[PDB]
Amino acid sequence: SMDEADRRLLRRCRLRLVEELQVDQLWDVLLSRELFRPHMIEDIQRAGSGSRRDQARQLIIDLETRGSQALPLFISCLEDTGQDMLASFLRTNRQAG
Amino acid sequence: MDAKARNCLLQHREALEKDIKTSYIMDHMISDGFLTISEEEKVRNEPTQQQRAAMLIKMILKKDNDSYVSFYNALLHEGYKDLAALLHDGIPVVS
C-alpha cells in the first residue's frame, strides 16, 4: 500500500524525525483521522522505555504499514498539532516530484 | 567488506556488545540507508542489549565497507568515543 518513495523517505529522514517528533498531542489526531487504530496507538505509546523518542521511532516504523495515504495523513496530523517545520520538510520532499 | 574492516569488527565485537546501545545507532544506519526496518526489528526483538548489539554486529559483518563507516560515525556521534577509536584501525573514513 505505502509506496517505496514514501517508505524510503521515512527511512532517510529517520534521525530528523525521531529527534523532532512531539507525540503527546498527536495521539488524538492519529485516532481522529484514523491513521492508526486504537490498539496500535497504545503499542506506540508503550514502545521501549516509553520515552518521547522511542514512541516517535515506533510511530514512524508502523507508519509504513498504514497504506498509500499514510504519509499525507501523517502530515495532516503534524500540522493540526502545530508541528509546521516538520510538516513542511516532509511536504517539500514528497512534492519534489 | 574489507578484510581489515571485518577483522577489526571481530577483534572488538565483544567490547562493543558489552557497552553499546543499538537504538540510536540503528537510527543513524537507517537514515544512512545501511540498515533495513526488518533488520532493525530482528535486532530490537532480542531479549538483552548484548544480543541486540551482537545481532547488529552480526549483520554489519556481512555488509559493505560503507556500513562499517556508518557504524563508526554512529558510535562517535553517539558518544562511544573509545570504541570508535578501537575501530579506527579497520578503515574509518568520514567522522
Swiss-Prot record, chain A:
PTM section of the record: Caspase-8 and -10 can also be involved in these processing events.
Stretches that traverse the bilayer: none
Tissues in which the protein is found: Ubiquitous, with highest expression in the heart, moderate expression in liver, skeletal muscle, and pancreas. Low levels in all other tissues. Within the heart, specifically expressed in myocytes.
Domain CARD span(s) in chain numbering: 2-93
Function per UniProt: Involved in the activation cascade of caspases responsible for apoptosis execution. Binding of caspase-9 to Apaf-1 leads to activation of the protease which then cleaves and activates effector caspases caspase-3 (CASP3) or caspase-7 (CASP7). Promotes DNA damage-induced apoptosis in a ABL1/c-Abl-dependent manner. Proteolytically cleaves poly(ADP-ribose) polymerase (PARP). Cleaves BIRC6 following inhibition of BIRC6-caspase binding by DIABLO/SMAC.
Family: Belongs to the peptidase C14A family.
Complex and partners: Heterotetramer that consists of two anti-parallel arranged heterodimers, each one formed by a 35 kDa (p35) and a 10 kDa (p10) subunit. Caspase-9 and APAF1 bind to each other via their respective NH2-terminal CED-3 homologous domains in the presence of cytochrome C and ATP. Interacts (inactive form) with EFHD2. Interacts with HAX1. Interacts with BIRC2/c-IAP1, XIAP/BIRC4, BIRC5/survivin, BIRC6/bruce and BIRC7/livin. Interacts with ABL1 (via SH3 domain); the interaction is direct and increases in the response of cells to genotoxic stress and ABL1/c-Abl activation. Interacts with BCL2L10.
Protein name, entry field: Caspase-9
The organism of origin for this protein: Homo sapiens (Human)
Shown chain mapped onto the complete sequence: 1 to 96 of 416
From Swiss-Prot, chain B:
Location of the protein in the cell: Cytoplasm
Start and end residues of each CARD domain: 1-90
Induction: By E2F and p53/TP53 in apoptotic neurons. Translation is inhibited by HNRPA1, which binds to the IRES of APAF1 mRNAs.
Tissues expressing this chain: Ubiquitous. Highest levels of expression in adult spleen and peripheral blood leukocytes, and in fetal brain, kidney and lung. Isoform 1 is expressed in heart, kidney and liver.
Domain of life per record: Eukaryota
Domain notes: The CARD domain mediates interaction with APIP. The monomeric form is autoinhibited in a closed conformation through a bound ADP at the nucleotide binding site. Exchange of ADP for ATP and binding of cytochrome c trigger a large conformational change where the first WD repeat region swings out, allowing the NB-ARC domain to rotate and expose the contact areas for oligomerization.
Function: Oligomeric Apaf-1 mediates the cytochrome c-dependent autocatalytic activation of pro-caspase-9 (Apaf-3), leading to the activation of caspase-3 and apoptosis. This activation requires ATP. Isoform 6 is less effective in inducing apoptosis.
Subunit annotation: Monomer. Oligomerizes to a heptameric ring, known as the apoptosome, upon binding of cytochrome c and dATP. Oligomeric Apaf-1 and pro-caspase-9 bind to each other via their respective NH2-terminal CARD domains and consecutively mature caspase-9 is released from the complex. Pro-caspase-3 is recruited into the Apaf-1-pro-caspase-9 complex via interaction with pro-caspase-9. Interacts with APIP. Interacts (via CARD and NACHT domains) with NAIP/BIRC1 (via NACHT domain). Interacts with CIAO2A.
Extra facts: Physiological concentrations of calcium ions negatively affect the assembly of apoptosome by inhibiting nucleotide exchange in the monomeric form.
Name recorded for this polypeptide: Apoptotic protease-activating factor 1
Naturally occurring in which organism (per UniProt): Homo sapiens
The organism's taxonomic lineage, starting at the top: Eukaryota, Metazoa, Chordata, Craniata, Vertebrata
Entire-sequence positions represented here: 1 to 95 of 1248
